[PDB]
Amino acid sequence: TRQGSRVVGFMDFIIALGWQIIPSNIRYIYILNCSQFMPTSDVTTIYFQADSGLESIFVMDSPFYASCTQQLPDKTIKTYGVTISKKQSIISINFSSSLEPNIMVSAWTASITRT
Amino acid sequence: TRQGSRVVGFMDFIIALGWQIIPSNIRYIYILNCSQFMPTSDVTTIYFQADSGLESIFVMDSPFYASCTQQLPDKTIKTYGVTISKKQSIISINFSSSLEPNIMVSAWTASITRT
Amino acid sequence: TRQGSRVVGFMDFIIALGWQIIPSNIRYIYILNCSQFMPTSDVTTIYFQADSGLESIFVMDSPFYASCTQQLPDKTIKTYGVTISKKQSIISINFSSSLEPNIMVSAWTASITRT
């Protein structure tokens, strides 16, 4: 099993990611997760340069796909699709619509299995 | 702790399940997870015959309940309830509504505690 | 390191929480999770007194924020924000809207990275 982390300063906020590769007879499992974070603007994309560790989970053609939420002051919940892709050393995290500023986003986990 | 995996071919696509039993003198935790997958038709149910490992987590009368999402072409997010039950050796994964073909479904995890 | 579990009787139902601290030189994590549960009334807040172990994950000013769902009888899915905070030894789990009685709530996990 291989694992690592990456804490990213994006604009004026922090997002904290972890990755794992879990090998077995049947499959390799590629895990990407992210702690809760508070964006400071109407972010649609978070991007950064990855090192070799995090790069190593982007083995499939398909991006990772997860979901997350924010709770509005009126208590309605917004759900966002989260698509995480790599081009060269740049990782991009794309949200299905722009996030609300200054509201916490829930932690999320993506998982890809390669047979 | 005990754990395992099962890859399921269903129709013309794959889903990959992991399971864990985490015993303690406080509780047993039964974990079922699934990697992201891409259904190729508007399925409502994925079923298959369980292996010994996977059958071992179905100790309680209640089915496992989790949720997942798909991001539609217009960027709206559909959330699905996922109910996972066993009758004899047959495991059924029931989605609350039919999945959209050819769109990735997010990974999910379910957890039951027995005290 | 540090981890533990707490089974809480709240009114006439049970919720089962797990906590973990993952020290790190890079991404120091505090995790709170909860197994699926079935509330018996239209609860908005679950609260209880914590012991030192569970208290020990509430180091940040920011509450934990997660999400969970219920599959309603028409097979639509309602998503709830889950905000978990500590005041003195009382832990409060606040749902964004009152839960529907007698319907399973999905398991959830919250993750905070310190720094």
Could you describe the 3D structure shown?
Chain A has 115 residues and is mainly beta. The first copy, chain A, has one domain. Helix content of chain A is 3%, strand content 56%. In chain A, a hairpin with a 5-residue loop joins strand 5 and strand 6. The longest helix of chain A is centred in the middle third of the chain and has 4 residues. Chain A is globular and about 50 Å long. Chains in contact: A-B, A-C, B-C. Chains A and B meet through strand 5, strand 6 and strand 8 of A and strand 1, strand 2 and strand 5 of B. Chains A, B, C: This is Fiber. Chains A, B, C: Belongs to the adenoviridae fiber family.
Which features does this protein show?
four-stranded antiparallel sheet; mainly beta; 1 helix; Fiber (chains A, B, C); homotrimer; about 5% helix
Described by strand count, sense and barrel closure, the largest sheet of chain A is:
4 strands, antiparallel
Radius of gyration of chain A: 14 Å
**What class would the helix/strand composition of chain A place it in?**
mainly beta
Order of helices and strands of chain A: EEEEHEEEE
Strand order of the largest sheet of chain A: 1-2-3-8
Overall 3D form of chain A: globular
What portion of residues of chain A belong to β-strands?
over 45%
Helical fraction of chain A = under 10%
Q: How many domains of chain A, as an integer?
A: 1
Oligomeric state: homotrimer
What is the number of beta strands of chain A?
8
Largest interface: A-C, 26 and 21 residues
What is the terminal separation of chain A in angstroms?
16 Å
**Number of H- or I-type helical stretches of chain A:** 1
PDB class: viral protein
Keywords: viral protein
Assembly: trimeric
Entry title: Structure of the bovine atadenovirus type 4 fibre head protein
